[PDB]
Amino acid sequence: DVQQVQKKLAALEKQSGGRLGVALINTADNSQVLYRADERFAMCSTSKVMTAAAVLKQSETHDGILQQKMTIKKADLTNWNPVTEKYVGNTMTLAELSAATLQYSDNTAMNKLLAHLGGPGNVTAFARSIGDTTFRLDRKEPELNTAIPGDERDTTSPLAMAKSLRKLTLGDALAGPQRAQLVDWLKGNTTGGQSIRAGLPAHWVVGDKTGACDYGTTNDIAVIWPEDRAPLVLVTYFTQPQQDAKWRKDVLAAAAKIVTEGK
């Protein structure tokens, strides 16, 4: 029931030692389950969804732009280049870059997209264009990972990101072809196994983008299809008091189990 969900989330937060942010949107009736849903949390890598979506939006006008190439140079590399490191001295299309940053959370791929787009400010501009006035991307990787308490840079709220993810994957923020590609990329993510997914029934279909940064900030945003029922959009953000706190993916899994029970 709705009161036991609240009691349980509060208990989970107390047990975690950190600050928990949750926003679930049930598209069946647009009902919502909220917990610190209007509070700001550092987005970490979950901001990569808005970024890849900004590129997809461009492809709606500029035909074939997803195939535009960008050179990958040693100097472009960062602290995380699972895919990009294989293309040094070669090129990658915006599509390949989008796929790498979304499914492997490649930081270099992210920066290449930011460069193409003209900077973090233009990603924020795209968020605004889909009705998100909370989201704000201020820096590139890996600086956007500082997650300093009280610092609003590179942050957003659970509800704002939930609403945006919904518009992007199920709503009309993107055109049909672009929308389908984003959904497919999210479903093909390889980094969310121990997060939101871990707290859901194994047969449910899911698309998600994880995030993890300083202050033990552990995040994950997803679109969930429970069997043949209407899709669910869930955002689970979590951050801790210690700058060097270890990540708690298990906390996101627990939050997911709690808010999707009986859905």
Ligand SMILES: C[As](C)(=O)[O-]
């Ligand atoms: C590769 As990462 C920890 O910024 O999602």
